[PDB]
Structures are given as structure tokens and as C-alpha cells.
């Protein structure tokens, strides 16, 4: 399986905060997708991150959010910036291993809350 652990509250002071998901698998040298969203109805996708063996942490956005690429041993880190007041909502983490098939996902990773 895969399990996910992240903060229960993180007040983004001055539109600046760091969000991280504690992932559970081997060190590195595989292929993956570690997504981040906003809403349980999948209202928004905020960022998603993958890196090849040599190729570094590829990082982009699909609703124009600000995202940097940071990776450690078996943990991810999201450098999110440029926040607002209304989009304050719950934030959840996602994971999907590919090799091997099939995929035995995690329960809904509890997530985090921001201000």
C-alpha cells in the first residue's frame, strides 16, 4: 500500500507556508505521481510532481498556482505561494504507484488546512 501523513493546521502567515506529505515506500529510483488538490469533490488541482531517474523534480500547475519542486529521501515538499482569502479550503494529498500493477491505493489521506 501507500500511506500519507501531513500537517493538521498551517496558518500561512503573509501568504507564505510550506506543505509536505510524508510518503511511505522505498528510497528512490522508481516512477510515480504525487498530486495535490483542493476540495473532496476534486474542485481544484493545485500541483503535481514527478521526477525521472536523472531528470530532476519536474513541477508545474494546472490552475495557475505557484509551485516549486522539492524532494528528499521519501518525502515531498510543496513551496506554495500567492494565496488569497476565499480559496481558503481543505487541502489533500494523493499518491499513485505504477509498477507493479495493480494499484492498492491509500484511504483518503487526512490532509491539512490553511489560512
Amino acid at each position: 500500500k501507500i500511506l500519507v501523513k501531513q500537517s493538521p493546521m498551517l496558518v500561512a502567515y503573509d501568504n507564505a507556508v510550506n506543505l509536505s506529505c510524508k510518503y511511505s515506500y522505498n528510497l528512490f529510483s522508481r516512477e510515480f505521481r504525487a498530486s495535490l488538490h483542493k476540495g473532496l469533490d476534486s474542485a481544484v488541482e493545485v500541483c503535481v510532481v514527478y521526477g525521472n531517474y536523472s531528470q530532476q523534480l519536474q513541477v508545474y500547475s494546472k490552475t495557475g498556482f505557484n509551485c516549486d519542486g522539492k524532494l528528499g529521501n521519501e518525502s515531498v515538499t510543496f513551496y506554495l505561494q500567492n494565496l488569497y482569502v476565499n480559496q481558503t479550503d481543505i487541502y489533500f494529498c494523493k499518491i499513485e504507484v505504477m509498477y507493479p500493477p495493480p494499484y492498492l491505493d491509500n484511504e483518503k489521506s487526512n490532509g491539512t488546512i490553511i489560512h
Epitope: 514527478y50 494546472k62 499513485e96 505504477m98 500493477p101 495493480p102 494499484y103
Partner: antibody
Framework: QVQLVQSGAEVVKPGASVKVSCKAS????????IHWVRQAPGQGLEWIGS????????NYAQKFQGRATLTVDTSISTAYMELSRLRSDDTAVYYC?????????????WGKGTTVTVSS | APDIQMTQSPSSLSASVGDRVTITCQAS??????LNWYQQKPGKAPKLLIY???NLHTGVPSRFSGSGSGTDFTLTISSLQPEDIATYYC?????????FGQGTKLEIKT
């Protein structure tokens, strides 16, 4: 040999469905988010849905949900498209196109298209 | 939240062989960068030309360049050639649903 073998010249009345085939090979069939794209003669192309065994949850187009039905099979690396209740305005040239790995923004290799004509 | 609108002009032009042709691609919403240029001669399978706003997709000569500073990007064909006789397309890729479905049919001039 990184391509998509498409089905043959299939033609039937309106309202009846159609089962299309798209065999994949030369790469990881179990990735890359197979798509389907039909070409209505008179204007450009179209889009219906993306498909992956992992996220068979509902991600289609507005007047497409309930009508199209995408499937796959890893044992022979094949994808199938099945449009139902085919109205006359559904006549088009259907393609299966492949997105890049884990993403969907570019279409990598396009299927060789399909003869799909309906009339009267 | 009505999907997306993709405008491509023209439906068909008549440009000579070798003339610099640069076809535009405009949207009604704010797609930061999700354009995809599909060379599609009328009849054959679509051929992706550039897998970004302006990024040379492999298998396509170094003359198929693009450009754009802001909301509306473009594509710069330096020299028009005989194999470019096609119906060009640009894709959007930010939110579902998806319809490029316009057609810029570059017909030959004589």
C-alpha cells in the same frame, strides 16, 4: 512500431451503437492515458474522454456522459470506444490518440483513424 | 462553468510557397501555457508539431517555431513548404472539456 492499430470501415444506421478497437504496442500500454478524437467533416477535430484503469472515475465531456464508454485490456494491450444512441450529427472520423506518460497535455502518436459514417 | 473557446483564423488562407506564415490562436479564458500545434493534412492522422506554447516537438524541423507573451500565443512557420499543405490546429489543455475543432486549412496558391 509505436503506433495505434485502429479498427476497420464500420458503418451502421443512426441510434445504434458502435464498438471500436485500438490496439497499442511499442510502449507501456498500461500508461499514457489513451484518448479518443473524432473528426466531424466540415470543421476540426473533437474530444470525448481520457481513459486509464486507475482513474475510471467520471472525467468525460458534457453531452458525452452516458453515451461514450471507454475500455482497455492489458493482456493484449487494446483500447475500445463505444458510442451509443448515434445521432446523425455523430458521423465523423474517429481516432485514438496517446498522451505522454502520467500527463495529458500533448498527444504523442495518433491512431490511423476510422471510417464512421451514418445516414438516413 | 462553460468549458473553453478556441478561435483560430483563418478557416482557410492562400499563402504562396516559402512565404512566412504565422497563424494565431486566441482563447477567451486564461490558459497560462497549454497550446498544442497539430499539423494535419486533410486526410491523414494528426501530427503533433509542438508540445507546448513554443517548444520544438521531436520529429519536426527546426523551422516550426512559436511565440507568445501573455494570454495569446502564436506559431511561426519561417518558410512554407509543399508538405505544409494542411489544416493546422492548436489545442488547449487546462480544464475539461476540450475542443480545438476549428481548422486552419492552408490551401495552395496558383
Amino acid at each position: 512500431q509505436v503506433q495505434l492499430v485502429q479498427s476497420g470501415a464500420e458503418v451502421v444506421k443512426p441510434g445504434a451503437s458502435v464498438k471500436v478497437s485500438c490496439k497499442a504496442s511499442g510502449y507501456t500500454f498500461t500508461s499514457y492515458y489513451i484518448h479518443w478524437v473524432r473528426q466531424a467533416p466540415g470543421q476540426g477535430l473533437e474530444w470525448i474522454g481520457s481513459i486509464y484503469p486507475g482513474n475510471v472515475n467520471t472525467n468525460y465531456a458534457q453531452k458525452f456522459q452516458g453515451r461514450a464508454t471507454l475500455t482497455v485490456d492489458t493482456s493484449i494491450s487494446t483500447a475500445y470506444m463505444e458510442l451509443s444512441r448515434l445521432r446523425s450529427d455523430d458521423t465523423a472520423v474517429y481516432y485514438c490518440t496517446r498522451s505522454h506518460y502520467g500527463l495529458d497535455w500533448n498527444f504523442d502518436v495518433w491512431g490511423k483513424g476510422t471510417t464512421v459514417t451514418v445516414s438516413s | 462553468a462553460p468549458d473553453i473557446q478556441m478561435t483560430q483564423s483563418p478557416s482557410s488562407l492562400s499563402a504562396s510557397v516559402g512565404d512566412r506564415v504565422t497563424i494565431t490562436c486566441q482563447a477567451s479564458q486564461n490558459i497560462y501555457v497549454w497550446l498544442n500545434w497539430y499539423q494535419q493534412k486533410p486526410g491523414k492522422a494528426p501530427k503533433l508539431l509542438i508540445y507546448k506554447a513554443s517548444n520544438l516537438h521531436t520529429g519536426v524541423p527546426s523551422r516550426f517555431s512559436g511565440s507568445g507573451s501573455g494570454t495569446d500565443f502564436t506559431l511561426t512557420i519561417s518558410s512554407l513548404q509543399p508538405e505544409d499543405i494542411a489544416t493546422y490546429y492548436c489545442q488547449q489543455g487546462q480544464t475539461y472539456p476540450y475542443t480545438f475543432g476549428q481548422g486552419t486549412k492552408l490551401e495552395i496558391k496558383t
